[PDB]
Amino acid sequence: NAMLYPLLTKTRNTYDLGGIWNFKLGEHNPNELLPSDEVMVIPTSFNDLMVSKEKRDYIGDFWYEKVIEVPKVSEDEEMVLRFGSVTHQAKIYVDGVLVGEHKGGFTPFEVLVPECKYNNEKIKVSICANNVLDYTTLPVGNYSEIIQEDGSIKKKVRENFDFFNYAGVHRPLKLMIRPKNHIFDITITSRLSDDLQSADLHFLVETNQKVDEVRISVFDEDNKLVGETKDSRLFLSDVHLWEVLNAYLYTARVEIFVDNQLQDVYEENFGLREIEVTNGQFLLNRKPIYFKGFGKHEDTFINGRGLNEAANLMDLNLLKDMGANSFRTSHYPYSEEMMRLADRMGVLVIDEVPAVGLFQNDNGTWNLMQTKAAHEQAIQELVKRDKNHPSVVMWVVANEPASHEAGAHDYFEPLVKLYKDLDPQKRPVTLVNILMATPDRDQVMDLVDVVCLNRYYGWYVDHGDLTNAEVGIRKELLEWQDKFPDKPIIITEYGADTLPGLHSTWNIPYTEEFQCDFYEMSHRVFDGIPNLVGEQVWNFADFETNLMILRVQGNHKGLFSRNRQPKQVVKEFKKRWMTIPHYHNKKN
Amino acid sequence: NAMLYPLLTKTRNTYDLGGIWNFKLGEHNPNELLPSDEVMVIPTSFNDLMVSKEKRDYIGDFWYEKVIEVPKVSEDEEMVLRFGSVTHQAKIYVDGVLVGEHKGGFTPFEVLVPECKYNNEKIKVSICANNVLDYTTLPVGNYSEIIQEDGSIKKKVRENFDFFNYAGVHRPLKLMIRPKNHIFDITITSRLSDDLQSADLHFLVETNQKVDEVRISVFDEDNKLVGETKDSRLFLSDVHLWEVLNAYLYTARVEIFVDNQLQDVYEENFGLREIEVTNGQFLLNRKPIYFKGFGKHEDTFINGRGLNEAANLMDLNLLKDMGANSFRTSHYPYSEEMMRLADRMGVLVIDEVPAVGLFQNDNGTWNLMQTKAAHEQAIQELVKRDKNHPSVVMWVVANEPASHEAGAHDYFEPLVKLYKDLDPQKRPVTLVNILMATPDRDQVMDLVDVVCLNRYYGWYVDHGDLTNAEVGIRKELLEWQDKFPDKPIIITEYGADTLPGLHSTWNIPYTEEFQCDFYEMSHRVFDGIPNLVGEQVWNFADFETNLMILRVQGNHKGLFSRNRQPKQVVKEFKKRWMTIPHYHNKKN
Ligand SMILES: [Mg+2]
Ligand SMILES: [Mg+2]
């Protein structure tokens, strides 16, 4: 139900509830008042703000609590709490009463404040967050309980993924006063003309109640009126297209009317562009694109997975300065803020649900992977939240699932359909593939539009041995190309752990020089694979992980450090990506 | 035949041949003259002096060559070339003629220069070194050949050990002019009195030819004469014992005589001390010792495995400043220079042969481990070279062999006997044990006097999880103690990779703080195991290895960096080891 970015309009009062909240790890009676012994900030991951390991590794319930003043709410209005997200599960209390609930740590939801409380001076909001991951959650966790002889129970999650399980309220929480009868959803659809110069627009507006009139006023980047309709249909002559690294955004002001008066007004941006996949190519505006960019993480010192709009912008500025043009939201939906920024900057985005960890670890006879419900929900929420973004060019169903094992096809078949059935634009959906699932073994890739591969020849296979890595990477890309002559291929991950300061004359893995050598070898291969249409390094920047022997205080495959300072290899990518055009047809 | 340290005496002219030699990787006709295009230094590993990887990774023949002036050699003398060692195999040429040969990269050998060449002005010395490791060599290598389509053959060695395969002439080469009839060997034996105040000495002098008289003059540390014998027997009243960190060395001047005149004179040092193992204790001078120190490597920037006497001393100074008292020559005999220094400083030494890598990697039906010959030779050479060192308190037969697999017992049974049969002092022999070979599985430890364990709970098992590591380490030491109530236990390796500069509040492996935490947990366990009589960290200093994913530009488990700068944890060891006395009886 929370699919619309919270805006301030003359009919919608939006209040930011961020700041300091009373805070507690562990159990709490929401009928009672949390002390100010512990506090926590909203938004931010809580983990790094803890000074001890035991606290940073806490798993279970933890609470945020604040007494909040009730604004003026008129008879025809209602009041909702709107969360960008709570990680991973959340129960929301008003005055000690359970009033809403959510599962999924990376998508927004709203919670209605009971009408009977609108004439009160104050309300106490209590948020019971929970950071347990399961075989029933996304991402997938290995959950276990050990009794302490205390004998309290210690909960722990052995992540089935390579990123630290940051938890907390990572995204802005809003107190939202809006009309009872309001605009629930807006879907924007366009059919571009033969020559790509005009657009037949369809604005599909959802309401809960009867409306007399629905006026839509479209404005261009100069805020000049260029179209108006009362029937949901608009024809725009001589449009400006949304082009890679050269964005053009229209904004659709939607006003609804009952009995000759404004009931609700919302402003939704859209961009005009066409996506197609054919002949081993990714077409944007009917021209062949070459992806260059990064797998990313929402990760930063101090804030962990919490939203930092300034990091979004610093990254995006660097991306574009490098000559890059895209990135993937690995391994979970990013914040709305980041999406709106990619739109504004013309950056291509591969948008993914948190389906990472779908891989067991004899044996497995019993049904342990109960992920289907969460998966279906994740897909619905992402498409409903993100479908209007011109920057979203493709969906990902999973990252590195066990796609070579029996039962894989039948799990993904309906989920891929779901993206198609839900996306008005029917964008391509992909599946990101692990090295184990080789062309012969894999049994899922027939279902998808674009082949995405994470490959580390010269790092995990043939470690530090480029001569043989080259033969391996080339061999496999040729098998993929052959098995699917039709589909485009995108390297969604490739890189090499690199610690700033480590140096060698002898191409030594972990040194800055080896990072350069690794990418040279990789690009020499890619450039000779006709159906390979894009390359996205892992990772943009170094990032936090859990304790595992092959992680040297986090992942270090970043071109930048966690503090966003460049490694040696950045100069090299800048020379390469400024030489390859965005609209680059190889083939030729 | 090269068991005596090369000394200058009035009968023995010893010339250092070190410096610049013509040098070539690859094939060479020793009848022809190597150009001065390439040069190399003696002594040093060649690898790090190569600017390209292909050269640094070279495997096969490589040559050193120099024209050398012939000194005056009288009719009763002979001239030999004496090598501290050549790594790994060596063939020696004089004037293009093969004149001697050696296998084993860490022990000394001599090569007679043909008498017919003594009246020549010059001789050309050619050294064909070879750095191939095999299933027939020690250390054990995984050897393979791939044809290049050049089509030359690329030789490569996949080390079966965790240290970089440095090769070259690592130790001083001497041109040695000595009497035809000379002192070949001196073995020093002592029986100390009941109260440890006197010593019955037996000096066993080997000659090749008849001698009329053998006079032995013993001098104390003040060069004062305290004993003299002509019958090989000497009784010394009121001796000064060689004590841990408080060394006392006598020196035995051995003179031989034919027909009333000096034929040869040699000076051999010895120290007086008694070693015994009983009741789960290691007795030195009949008092229980507690080992504190390091596994080491002969490793240093630039020089690789080449001899650097100043590094020996800087390490030893640090060792003793820390309150430590021992170290192991892992994983190969150190230079004579280091041994003589340990004697002079009172440091205990566990002396080992290069028997590392005795572990396969289905299957194995065929006899692939042909290591027995090399093993027997290594043992003979080490005992013959090192038996007189008071600092050598124990022998190691192997490091981390597959001692849990069938056939292990029968391989080691005769090799352990060999140490006993060869060592006049019958010192303890041990075997250093890998984690796979657990008390139940292991089948070799009954053969040995002292239990040595390399254990990494909290690093390889239970990575970064101290709570569980503690239970594991304790559990296993209790099983060992139980299975062998008789034998002392020594932790010969324990530590944690640590990169200088990496820091965290949250006990994160690879950070300096975690290194400290890891050792605290380990010592808390050790202190409660009555039969554990010693602790030797891995490693003294960071060191070079080959390319393998869990090696971040070498091994970083060192308390010091490769440049010998301290990590955080050094302060901690200094507090602990200065509090534990050398003669420390736990039990109690
Ligand atoms: Mg199953
Ligand atoms: Mg066999």
Fold of A180-274: Immunoglobulin-like (2.60.40)
Task: Find, among A179, A244, A248, the residue nearest to A218 by Cα.
Answer: A248
What is the spatial distance between Cα A184 and Cα A254, in angstroms, rounded to a whole number?
11
A508 contacts in chain B (CB < 8 Å): 547, 553
What is the spatial distance between Cα A300 and Cα A164, in angstroms, rounded to a whole number?
12
B509 contacts in chain A (CB < 8 Å): 547, 549, 553
B56 contacts in chain A (CB < 8 Å): 506
- For residue B512, give the chain A residue with the closest CA: A553
**Residue B241: both structure tokens together:** 């014992």
User: For residue A587, how many C-alpha atoms fall within 13 Å in the half-sphere facing its CB?
Assistant: 16
- The whole-angstrom distance between A502's CA and the closest CA on chain B is 8
B502 contacts in chain A (CB < 8 Å): 552-553
Task: Find, among A492, A496, A491, A439, the residue nearest to A462 by Cα.
Answer: A496
CA angle, B379 then B306 then B18, to 5° = 105
Q: How many CB atoms lie within 10 A of CB B509?
A: 24
- Give how far Cα B510 sits from Cα of B464, B491, B503, B567, Å: 9, 21, 8, 12
The torsion angle over the Cα atoms of residues A444, A448, A451 and A456, rounded to 10 degrees, is -40
Active centre residues of A (catalytic): 400, 493
Three-class DSSP category at A530: coil
What is the spatial distance between Cα A10 and Cα A262, in angstroms, rounded to a whole number?
10
Q: Provide the total of helices (H) and of strands (E) in chain B, helices listed first.
A: 8, 32
Beta carbons of A560 and A570 less than 8 angstroms apart: yes
User: For residue B191, how many C-alpha atoms fall within 13 Å in the half-sphere facing its CB?
Assistant: 6
Phi, psi of A127 (to 5 degrees): -120, 115
- Give how far Cα A27 sits from Cα of A14, A33, A41, A68, Å: 31, 13, 19, 22
Task: Find, among B200, B276, B219, B285, the residue nearest to B246 by Cα.
Answer: B285
Contacts by B403-407 with C-beta closer than 8 Å and gap 24+?
Answer: B403/B431, B403/B433, B403/B434, B403/B437, B403/B442, B403/B443, B403/B444, B403/B445, B404/B436, B404/B437, B404/B438, B404/B441, B404/B442, B404/B443, B406/B443
Q: What one-character DSSP code corresponds to residue B332?
A: S
Kindly list the domain boundaries of chain B, sorted by start residue: 1-179, 180-274, 275-588
B369 CA → ligand 2 middle, Å:
7
Provide the CATH number for the domain formed by B275-588 in this structure: 3.20.20.80
Check B463 against A549: CB less than 8 A apart.
yes
Ligand minimally distant from the alpha carbon of residue B368: 2
Check A52 against B509: CB less than 8 A apart.
no
What separation, in Å, do the N-terminal and C-terminal C-alpha atoms of chain B show?
Answer: 47
Q: How many CB atoms lie within 10 A of CB A570?
A: 17
One DSSP character per residue, A77-136 reads: EEEEEEES--BSEEEEEETTEEEEEEE-TTS-EEEEPPGGGTTSSEEEEEEEEE----SS
What is the spatial distance between Cα B113 and Cα A458, in angstroms, rounded to a whole number?
49
Task: Find, among A129, A80, A79, A124, the residue nearest to A101 by Cα.
Answer: A129
Check B465 against A504: CB less than 8 A apart.
no
Experimental approach was X-ray
Three-class DSSP category at A153: strand
Beta carbons of B469 and B521 less than 8 angstroms apart: yes
Three-class DSSP category at B422: helix
Report the binding-site residues of A for D-glucuronate: 162, 399, 454, 460, 493, 538, 557
| β-strands A291-295, A532-537 pairing | parallel
Three-class DSSP category at A354: coil
Candidates A148, A549, A551, A561: best to mutate against B (most CBs of B within 10 A) is A549
| β-strands B429-433, B450-454 pairing | parallel
One DSSP character per residue, B115-163 reads: GGGTTSSEEEEEEEEE----SSSSS-EEEEEEE-SSS-EEEEEEESSSS
- The whole-angstrom distance between A553's CA and the closest CA on chain B is 6
Q: How many CB atoms lie within 10 A of CB B45?
A: 26
- Give how far Cα A394 sits from Cα of A217, A375, A533, Å: 29, 17, 14
Three-class DSSP category at A277: strand
Candidates B508, B517, B555: best to mutate against A (most CBs of A within 10 A) is B508
How buried is residue A302: exposed, middle or buried, by Cβ count under 10 Å (0-12/13-18/19+)? exposed
**Residue B369: both structure tokens together:** 């481990």
Catalytic-role residue among B77, B381, B493, B535: B493
Cis peptide before B114 (omega within 30 of 0): no
Q: Is A435 on the interface with B (CB under 8 A)?
A: no
Max Cα-Cα span within chain A: 79
CA angle, B276 then B280 then B281, to 5° = 45
Candidates B57, B506, B550: best to mutate against A (most CBs of A within 10 A) is B506
Task: Find, among B173, B73, B106, the residue nearest to B374 by Cα.
Answer: B106
**Residue B556: both structure tokens together:** 């970083």
Match domain A1-179 to its CATH number in 1.20.140.10, 2.30.42.10, 2.60.120.260, 2.30.40.10. 2.60.120.260
How buried is residue A534: exposed, middle or buried, by Cβ count under 10 Å (0-12/13-18/19+)? buried
What is the spatial distance between Cα B429 and Cα B421, in angstroms, rounded to a whole number?
12
| β-strands A141-147, A153-159 pairing | antiparallel
What is the spatial distance between Cα B75 and Cα B85, in angstroms, rounded to a whole number?
29
The torsion angle over the Cα atoms of residues A394, A400, A404 and A408, rounded to 10 degrees, is -60
Q: What is the resolution of this structure in A?
A: 2.6
Q: Is A464 on the interface with B (CB under 8 A)?
A: yes
Task: Find, among B455, B461, B411, B410, the residue nearest to B434 by Cα.
Answer: B455
Catalytic-role residue among B78, B400, B405, B476: B400
Tokens 């919608």, located at residue: A12
One DSSP character per residue, A389-448 reads: -TTEEEEEEEES--TTSTTHHHHHHHHHHHHHHH-TT---EEEEE-TTS-TTT--SGGG-
Phi, psi of B339 (to 5 degrees): -65, -45
Check B552 against A502: CB less than 8 A apart.
yes
What is the spatial distance between Cα A393 and Cα A428, in angstroms, rounded to a whole number?
7
Nearest to A463 among B506, B510, B548 (CB): B548
Q: Where are the beta strands (DSSP E) in B307-388?
A: 326-328, 348-352
Q: How many CB atoms lie within 10 A of CB A18?
A: 16
Pick left, alpha or beta for residue B245 (phi over 0 → left; psi -120 to 50 → alpha; otherwise beta): left
Alpha-carbon Rg for chain B in angstroms: 25
What is the spatial distance between Cα A509 and Cα A518, in angstroms, rounded to a whole number?
9
What separation, in Å, do the N-terminal and C-terminal C-alpha atoms of chain A show?
Answer: 47
Q: Is A366 on the interface with B (CB under 8 A)?
A: no
What is the spatial distance between Cα B101 and Cα B526, in angstroms, rounded to a whole number?
47
**Residue B569: both structure tokens together:** 């944890």
Q: Provide the total of helices (H) and of strands (E) in chain A, helices listed first.
A: 8, 32
